[PDB]
Ligand binder design. Sequence first.
Ligand SMILES: CC(C)NC(=O)N[C@H]1CC[C@H](Nc2ncc3ccc(=O)n(C(C)C)c3n2)CC1
Length: 349
Amino acid sequence: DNQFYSVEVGDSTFTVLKRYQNLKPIGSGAQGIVCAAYDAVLDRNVAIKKLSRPFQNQTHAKRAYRELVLMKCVNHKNIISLLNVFTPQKTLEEFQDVYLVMELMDANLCQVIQMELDHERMSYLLYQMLCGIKHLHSAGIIHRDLKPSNIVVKSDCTLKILDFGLARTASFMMTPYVVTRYYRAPEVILGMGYKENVDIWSVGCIMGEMVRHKILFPGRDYIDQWNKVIEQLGTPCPEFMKKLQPTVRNYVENRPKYAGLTFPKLFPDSLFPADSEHNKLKASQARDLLSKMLVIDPAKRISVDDALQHPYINVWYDPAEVEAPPPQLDEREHTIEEWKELIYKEVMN
Ligand SMILES: CC(C)NC(=O)N[C@H]1CC[C@H](Nc2ncc3ccc(=O)n(C(C)C)c3n2)CC1
């Protein structure tokens, strides 16, 4: 009679379509709780994300609505896809929860980062990130909050990006949960405005952490984080600071100066496989790319296209893998009730 059933998972109550069986909790991010399950209809395992009352406030609503729309229309093998979307509630008045069904992946990038990685897999994950990023930039999407906890991978080293980044407005929250800021670009830290290669900084932070196994630029707030950045990379040039607004210019130019470590000192030979000649050269190529991704001034930072052409990365290069036909706009303020309906009717395609 009923085409849904409910079960308790960790805390939440998952009411899902009967095709999905044997639910098990596998995570809990900010926007929801996530279960693995078996899809009897597709005969495969899937991940199911539960959004509770996404329309409950502006922040949630914008994110949920955006997530749902973009993930539906954006298609690329390094961006996570929607398999199915549903709500167990029958009417707009009763509507509460949204369920996103996605491919089931094996791990976080955070998990992978902790592992000793060879050059083949390091360059391959990085290639896949750059292709994902590339696609998003083509579709008019610039992420600005790429981070290893929002990137998932499979045992076969397949990689997918989970989310579509910052809102082109941006906020407030009540839920107690800390937002991870360490992978954000200087231009996001300092409020400069940005271009596509804002996301390259993040990839540089991930790459560098894969090597060093520590977060490059930690800190309680953007104040500490900025310090960590200038300590390691040195203070930027005045051509860069001619692009800062008056108040942040003053703040930055009045921080204690630093000369900056060279990249061999930042990522020394010790941290790389360097036993064979193959590995010796790949280490050299690795550090080169790093030095071009982790530069404070975006004017001097490498682009996505030039990163994909870099020797460390272009060994994977292929035809329909770097490009495919890419495509409406929305970014405006609404009340709860208005968001509720926008999202309900996105769910009911
Ligand atoms: C036990 C130890 C090795 N840790 C894990 O196994 N962790 C998780 C296992 C499940 C993984 N799979 C996965 N697949 C798809 C999604 C889709 C959206 C989403 O938000 N998540 C989060 C749980 C990361 C997904 N996780 C993620 C890491």
